[PDB]
């Protein structure tokens, strides 16, 4: 069985009703990314930033937000390939987990976690973060921040991701925009180490000869059809 590495971005959770980074009007939920997605933004206006992620964390857990056919297909793919499968996601949502995927690498962190601003230790967290909310790891309780990787910060799990990029027989990018690095560079790394590269997306994430195989359309349509084709193949 082939080693398969899957990278997912915002596009896969779009049909589930989760909205992010349109590199068009430059807006995240009618916020400038500088203001809600950088360390400097958090430094300038922590109450705004905490409010923003409070809103995202709440919206994530609303009844109308469900994994879609694409998420389910990836859970089935992991079922079929077992340890020969790795899912890396740029997404901070828990929709892959709800669909049934396990050992998901959240390279940009998780909305349902916060982090101690002092120790850097993460903590499970489903509710709002208020100034009165402090860490569980220090004798003198420290402020908490979202466990989300901001532009300007280092992604998580990169050693493990680059190892898998080397090992992959097949690399699949799903719902990625191609504007966000280093994730957008993963296809180059995969192709350099001999992987067959596949893009499943609404719009091209990259210009030219990198993806050897490509299918475009709604994730809920393109992803299950590729996974089925892969599984019977």
């Amino acid at each position: 069985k082939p080693r398969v590495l899957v990278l997912t971005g915002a596009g896969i959770s779009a049909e589930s009703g989760i909205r992010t980074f349109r590199a068009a009007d430059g807006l995240w939920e009618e916020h400038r990314v500088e203001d809600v997605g950088t360390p400097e933004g958090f430094d300038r206006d922590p109450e705004l930033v905490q409010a923003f992620y409070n809103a995202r964390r709440r919206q994530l857990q609303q009844p109308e937000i469900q994994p879609n056919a694409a998420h389910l297909a990836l859970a089935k793919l992991q079922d079929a390939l077992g340890d020969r499968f790795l899912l890396v996601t740029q997404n901070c949502d828990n929709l892959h987990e709800r669909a049934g995927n396990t050992n998901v690498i959240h390279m940009h962190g998780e909305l349902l976690k916060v982090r101690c601003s002092q120790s850097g230790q993460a903590l499970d967290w489903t509710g709002d973060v208020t100034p009165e909310d402090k860490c569980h790891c220090c004798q003198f309780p420290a402020p908490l921040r979202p466990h989300v990787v901001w532009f300007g910060e280092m992604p998580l799990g990169m050693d493990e991701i680059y190892m898998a990029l080397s090992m992959a027989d097949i690399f699949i990018a799903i719902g990625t925009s191609g504007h966000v690095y280093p994730a957008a560079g993963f296809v180059h790394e995969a192709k350099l180490h001999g992987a067959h590269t596949v893009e499943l997306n609404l719009e091209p994430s990259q210009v030219g000869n990198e993806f050897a195989e490509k299918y475009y359309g709604p994730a809920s349509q393109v992803v299950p059809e590729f996974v089925e084709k892969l599984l019977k193949g």
Binding site: A23, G152, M154, M158, G178, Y181
Partner: peptide, 10 residues
């Protein structure tokens, strides 16, 4: 790989 960062063109 470097830090999370945005590219505007292409």
């Amino acid at each position: 790989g470097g830090a999370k960062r945005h590219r505007k063109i292409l």
